[PDB]
Amino acid sequence: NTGFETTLIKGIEPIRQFVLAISIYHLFDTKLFSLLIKHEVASPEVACNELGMEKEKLLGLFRYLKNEGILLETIDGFSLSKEGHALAPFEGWYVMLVGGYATTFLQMGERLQEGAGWATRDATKVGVGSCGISHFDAIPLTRSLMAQAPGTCTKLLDLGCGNGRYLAEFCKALPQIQAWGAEPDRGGFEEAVDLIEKEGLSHRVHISHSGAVEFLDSDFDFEPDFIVLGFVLHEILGQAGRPAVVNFLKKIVHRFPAINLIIIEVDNQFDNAGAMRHGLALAYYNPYYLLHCFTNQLLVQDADWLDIFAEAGLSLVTRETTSDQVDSTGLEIGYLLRRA
Amino acid sequence: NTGFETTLIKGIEPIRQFVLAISIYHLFDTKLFSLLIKHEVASPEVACNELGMEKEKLLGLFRYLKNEGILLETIDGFSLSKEGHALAPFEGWYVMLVGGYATTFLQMGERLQEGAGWATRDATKVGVGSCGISHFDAIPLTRSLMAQAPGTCTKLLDLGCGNGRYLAEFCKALPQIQAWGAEPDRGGFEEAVDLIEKEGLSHRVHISHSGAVEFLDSDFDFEPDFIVLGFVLHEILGQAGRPAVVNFLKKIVHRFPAINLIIIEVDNQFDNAGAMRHGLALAYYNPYYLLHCFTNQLLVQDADWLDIFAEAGLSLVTRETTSDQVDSTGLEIGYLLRRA
Numbered sequence: 135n136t137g138f139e140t141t142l143i144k145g146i147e148p149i150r151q152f153v154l155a156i157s158i159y160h161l162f163d164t165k166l167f168s169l170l171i172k173h174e175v176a177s178p179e180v181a182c183n184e185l186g187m188e189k190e191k192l193l194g195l196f197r198y199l200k201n202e203g204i205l206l207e208t209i210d211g212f213s214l215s216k217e218g219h220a221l222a223p224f225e226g227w228y229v230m231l232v233g234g235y236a237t238t239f240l241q242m243g244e245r246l247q248e249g250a251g252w253a254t255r256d257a258t259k260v261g262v263g264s265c266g267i268s269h270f271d272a273i274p275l276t277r278s279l280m281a282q283a284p285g286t287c288t289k290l291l292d293l294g295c296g297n298g299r300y301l302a303e304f305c306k307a308l309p310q311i312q313a314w315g316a317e318p319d320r321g322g323f324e325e326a327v328d329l330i331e332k333e334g335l336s337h338r339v340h341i342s343h344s345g346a347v348e349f350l351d352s353d354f355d356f357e358p359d360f361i362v363l364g365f366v367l368h369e370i371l372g373q374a375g376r377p378a379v380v381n382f383l384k385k386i387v388h389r390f391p392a393i394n395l396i397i398i399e400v401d402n403q404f405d406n407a408g409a410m411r412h413g414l415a416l417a418y419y420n421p422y423y424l425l426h427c428f429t430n431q432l433l434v435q436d437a438d439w440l441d442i443f444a445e446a447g448l449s450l451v452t453r454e455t456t457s458d459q460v461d462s463t464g465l466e467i468g469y470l471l472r473r474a
Numbered sequence: 475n476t477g478f479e480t481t482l483i484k485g486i487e488p489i490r491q492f493v494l495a496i497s498i499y500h501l502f503d504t505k506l507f508s509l510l511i512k513h514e515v516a517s518p519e520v521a522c523n524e525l526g527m528e529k530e531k532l533l534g535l536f537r538y539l540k541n542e543g544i545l546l547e548t549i550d551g552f553s554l555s556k557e558g559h560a561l562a563p564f565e566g567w568y569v570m571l572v573g574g575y576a577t578t579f580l581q582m583g584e585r586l587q588e589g590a591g592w593a594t595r596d597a598t599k600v601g602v603g604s605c606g607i608s609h610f611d612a613i614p615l616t617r618s619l620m621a622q623a624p625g626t627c628t629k630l631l632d633l634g635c636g637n638g639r640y641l642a643e644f645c646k647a648l649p650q651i652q653a654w655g656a657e658p659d660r661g662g663f664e665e666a667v668d669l670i671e672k673e674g675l676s677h678r679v680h681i682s683h684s685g686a687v688e689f690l691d692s693d694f695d696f697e698p699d700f701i702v703l704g705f706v707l708h709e710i711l712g713q714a715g716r717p718a719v720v721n722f723l724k725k726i727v728h729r730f731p732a733i734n735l736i737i738i739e740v741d742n743q744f745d746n747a748g749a750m751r752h753g754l755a756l757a758y759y760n761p762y763y764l765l766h767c768f769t770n771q772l773l774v775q776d777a778d779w780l781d782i783f784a785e786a787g788l789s790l791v792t793r794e795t796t797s798d799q800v801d802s803t804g805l806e807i808g809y810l811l812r813r814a
């Protein structure tokens with residue numbers, strides 16, 4: 135086995151990073167990251183008393199993270215290194231892809247078998263995580279499209295709202311807005327009620343435990359002038375089919391003829407060689423397309439969505455992609471539509 | 475968010491590799507890797523018929539692996555690239571750390587809480603995976619120590635045998651040996667019975683579904699002259715304590731006074747700054763030490779093991795580390811012992 139060790143260190147580099155990604159996810163999810171930001175330096179004993187943890191297990195996680203350069207160790211205790219501090223904006227990606235979809239990727243081997251069904255996910259962490267990401271890409275994109283509409287937003291409806299971050303950010307920036315969010319996952323719904331309460335927006339924002347299609351079939355007198363469907367239609371498309379998506383969009387404009395619809399979707403370019411060599415396409419969109427083949431969701435192309443909108447009796451006001459400072463792939467597309 | 479995308483691509487690089495490590499694990503575990511070696515080129519339809527898989531899910535995994543350069547796509551179908559072919563020797567590491575311990579690392583957040591207990595593992599994949607690794611490190615080390623003993627091996631006992639690879643390799647190379655293996659995990663035990671049958675060694679090798687301590691307490695007339703305890707004592711140490719390890723070793727030499735013991739253990743240097751900067755220490759030993767803090771296992775230092783052996787009434791014939799061509803960390807140590 136001459137020279138085997140050097141080949142082994144490169145050969146298992148994905149395993150080294152696999153354990154690191156899980157450990158970074160727990161550092162955020164358990165509140166240890168925010169505790170280390172607050173305390174600056176914290177001994178295992180102090181962190182255990184504050185979060186109700188066991189010393190020997192916490193010291194093991196801290197020693198592991200110190201060896202990887204995420205933490206520093208002084209006589210007073212452990213602290214986040216400069217590299218560890220720099221992880222702070224990316225929390226949403228770890229919570230969504232590790233917390234939400236680790237079980238989904240681990241189920242791929244068994245779900246490949248004929249008739250084994252769709253892989254499950256932790257929809258609470260998917261909702262919380264994707265909402266954390268939307269602060270950088272989907273919320274600024276929704277704002278740009280809202281500004282180009284022929285009317286001002288007063289009553290906003292967000293279906294598939296996750297933990298309610300889109301509504302929290304839009305309501306703080308636009309104090310006149312009255313909003314209603316709906317989230318089908320119970321864990322995500324409870325996170326949304328808590329985030330709205332924490333931000334002091336319960337008097338202006340209501341949250342319902344409901345799916346997008348059943349919300350439109352339910353009875354209510356609220357008359358929204360804007361509806362946000364952020365990464366919701368591809369779930370309906372996979373679960374119920376294309377005629378169900380067309381009928382869902384027809385029901386929105388039948389019930390609310392003057393509404394403005396803002397739809398955000400990911401253009402499926404999984405088999406586009408050039409698009410998949412972009413650094414962000416390889417880091418995020420390649421595993422995103424993979425998880426969509428194993429779950430009851432279906433991503434389609436930009437032209438396929440425009441065809442669906444035409445069939446549902448909608449007219450396109452404009453369409454845009456995200457800022458090239460956060461995501462320059464051109465794969466995240468936002469559409470502003472009205473009744474034709 | 476000026477320049478955010480470039481920071482994001484580096485910030486979520488551990489997530490990109492996390493999904494890749496899981497996908498590489500399934501490529502081996504589902505038999506798709508061996509199918510691609512055998513066929514050279516295979517369309518999704520051919521691979522689905524042979525392994526009983528669904529076309530749309532398999533095409534998704536193949537497109538994902540093509541974008542990462544693990545597979546090539548021609549008009550005839552998909553094939554392993556040169557980089558994909560080069561993964562073949564490392565199967566055991568993926569099966570052990572991803573198949574065996576992915577759930578363990580994912581449970582860290584919940585198991586950190588006071589009184590939450592030890593993290594579980596898939597002991598079948600741990601056994602199968604570690605046995606695949608032993609072909610490179612622990613089996614050649616056991617051979618070197620066996621050659622330095624004052625007697626020849628005729629009757630071998632392997633406690634914690636996994637899928638039985640140590641016994642299969644030693645029996646093929648030394649046709650006079652009669653061997654007995656014991657594995658406590660039922661899945662691993664069934665894999666061992668099948669591997670022994672597949673190799674044509676059932677007439678010379680027996681396998682029992684049993685733990686190491688309960689095997690020595692059970693009744694049998696087999697008189698081994700060699701006993702291999704490969705990464706077994708640190709499980710007993712964590713589960714039952716130091717006096718139980720000492721009593722277990724005393725019972726081996728009380729029952730078999732002329733036996734030769736070959737013990738393989740990992741030296742705990744988790745807090746040794748210099749040792750942890752070795753490329754293999756960071757890739758393998760850093761997550762190995764972390765998983766030992768969350769499971770009912772305890773790794774100790776080389777000197778701590780020598781103290782245990784002296785207390786149990788044992789004399790050290792010699793001790794060695796692995797070949798520097800496969801593992802030059804000096805952390806894997808093999809001990810050859812006899813009754814004092």
Ligand SMILES: NC(N)=NCCCC(=O)C(=O)O
Pocket residue numbers: 260264267268365400431466
């Ligand atoms: N951040 C981007 N691009 N959107 C992803 C939203 C979540 C999603 O679609 C899923 O988890 O299925």
Ligand SMILES: NC(N)=NCCCC(=O)C(=O)O
Pocket residue numbers: 600604607608705740771806
């Ligand atoms: N390959 C090496 N170094 N041995 C590890 C054996 C497995 C093990 O100890 C565990 O999974 O707990």
Ligand SMILES: [Mg+2]
Pocket residue numbers: 293294295296363364365366
């Ligand atoms: Mg949404």
Ligand SMILES: [Mg+2]
Pocket residue numbers: 365368369431
């Ligand atoms: Mg989706």
Ligand SMILES: [Mg+2]
Pocket residue numbers: 633634635636703704705706
């Ligand atoms: Mg063993």
Ligand SMILES: [Mg+2]
Pocket residue numbers: 705708709771
């Ligand atoms: Mg062990």
Ligand code: NA
Pocket residue numbers: 256257258259321
């Ligand atoms: Na959940």
Ligand code: NA
Pocket residue numbers: 416417420421490494542
């Ligand atoms: Na990728």
Ligand code: NA
Pocket residue numbers: 372426427428429430431432
């Ligand atoms: Na799907």
Ligand code: NA
Pocket residue numbers: 596597598599661
């Ligand atoms: Na198992």
Ligand code: NA
Pocket residue numbers: 150154202756757760761
């Ligand atoms: Na590491």
Ligand code: NA
Pocket residue numbers: 712766767768769770771772
């Ligand atoms: Na332990």
